[PDB]
């Protein structure tokens, strides 16, 4: 599925060697324990990234519908990835990369404080979600540090997703990162880092591309090599997740990219 | 300290008597462990009323600095009531109005409905409250059903306050009703029934008081008889939960009821 900033949020989690230590599985089960109970609460759905193993724990309430999940993915228990891969499918894709942009600063922020300290953060949104009509809802999504390990390494990060009490539209998810004990609520303005998560030039490559021309057309075009214009991209593929050119058009237009 | 709707809301709860119940204990100490577990993800306030003793059991996280509470008001665990004091006085006396509207309103509904239904749906609103600073914040406020006796009646009402993610201004509370497995959440107008807290007789005894006429002169000017003027002012007293004639003009100025 599309997707953004795979890699750059992979890099940062690469900066804890949590999948080195010997850590106490009891701890990760008090959590699902928790959030499982919460859900019961709340009507939605709890993930739990570990980041030992590099292994996702999902729970989806029977009320949860505001997903628009089928039967087969809501009876999932353990995904094996850091992140709950159907779930993300739901989320608007303009939505879906502001998300992932307040990811990034989150985790950039957190993972660089103290264990003690990054546990008083949270990153919060409001996201449309599909459900099984195909009509977006508006949704408020919660990232926040749940465990550190022994050495101070992140080891469980905490994302929840329930129906929002505000249905109002407004422009982007207002993303905000949050200091409980401070009482600080800062407004993340993302709007910058959305239209730079393609290059200009790749920019062009994928209007090019979406118009008809061929690499030679492309090459002509820019001035370029043929070369470069297949560096380029194949680099777009990768950084929206997508397998072709034709996807790589619908997710850059979908996500608004361009 | 100064309230309202503290009479109905005790009605509403006395149509679910639970005296004639041998209810185990068990259920509720497990709640308490959840609730204990949530404010140390959220940072916040959890208060868990039990109708079936009149008791409350409340759980204020160190962090919860937004709540302005001194030292020994945090370390309150079982408070003898359905709901805490000092956490009500340091909402905005405004907001408080409407809080309380909306409470009304959603045990009304909630306490009509079947046992497995009135637990579907939740009770939010978005509250000023001050803190240790003496600054208001805005702060998510929720009111659910968290718990059935045997016999089909309410016996635990969960509340949780926590920083809210938004803290820009508008007008009211924006108090929601939301039924969590269709997906729907009803707005609340609260204005009209905010204006007719007190009656408009009952407006104009305040206004006479705070005027400085005695029930005498009261009694002349609306042509009624002192012991009418007394059963007003009796009632007037009630309804705002103040002791005295002067803390119930300060108290209708401040939640603007005349
Ligand atoms: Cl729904
Ligand atoms: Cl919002
Ligand atoms: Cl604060
Ligand atoms: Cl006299
Ligand atoms: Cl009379």
């Keep these: 599925g599309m997707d953004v900033l795979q890699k750059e949020i992979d890099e940062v989690y690469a900066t804890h060697p949590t999948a080195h230590e010997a850590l106490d599985n ?3 089960e008090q959590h699902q ?6 859900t019961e609460v709340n009507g939605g759905c709890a993930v739990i990234s570990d980041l030992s193993n590099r292994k996702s724990y999902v729970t989806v309430h029977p009320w949860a519908n505001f997903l628009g999940l089928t039967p087969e993915e809501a009876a999932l228990s353990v ?19 502001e998300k992932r942009l307040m990811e990034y600063k989150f985790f950039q922020k957190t993972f660089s404080m103290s264990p003690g300290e990054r546990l008083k953060y949270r990153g919060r949104c409001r996201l449309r979600m599909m459900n099984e009509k195909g009509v977006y809802q508006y949704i408020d999504n919660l990232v926040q540090i749940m465990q550190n390990t022994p050495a101070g390494n992140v080891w469980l990060i905490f994302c929840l997703y329930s129906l929002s009490a505000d249905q109002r539209p407004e422009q982007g998810i207002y993303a905000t990162i949050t200091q409980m004990e401070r009482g600080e609520v800062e407004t993340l303005s993302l709007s910058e880092e959305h239209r730079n998560i393609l290059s200009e030039r790749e920019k ?55």
Tied chains: 1, 2.
């Design 204 to 258: 062009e490559i994928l209007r090019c591309i979406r118009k008809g021309l061929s690499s030679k057309e492309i090459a002509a075009t820019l001035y370029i090599s043929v070369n470069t214009v297949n560096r380029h991209r194949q680099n777009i593929l990768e950084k929206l997740s997508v397998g072709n050119s034709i996807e790589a058009c619908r997710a850059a237009e979908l996500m608004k990219l361009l």
């Design 79 to 97: 995904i094996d990835s850091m992140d709950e891969d159907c779930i993300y499918r739901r989320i608007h894709p303009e939505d879906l990369v």
């Design 26 to 28: 009891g701890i990760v």
């Design 33 to 38: 324990q928790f959030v499982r109970s919460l």
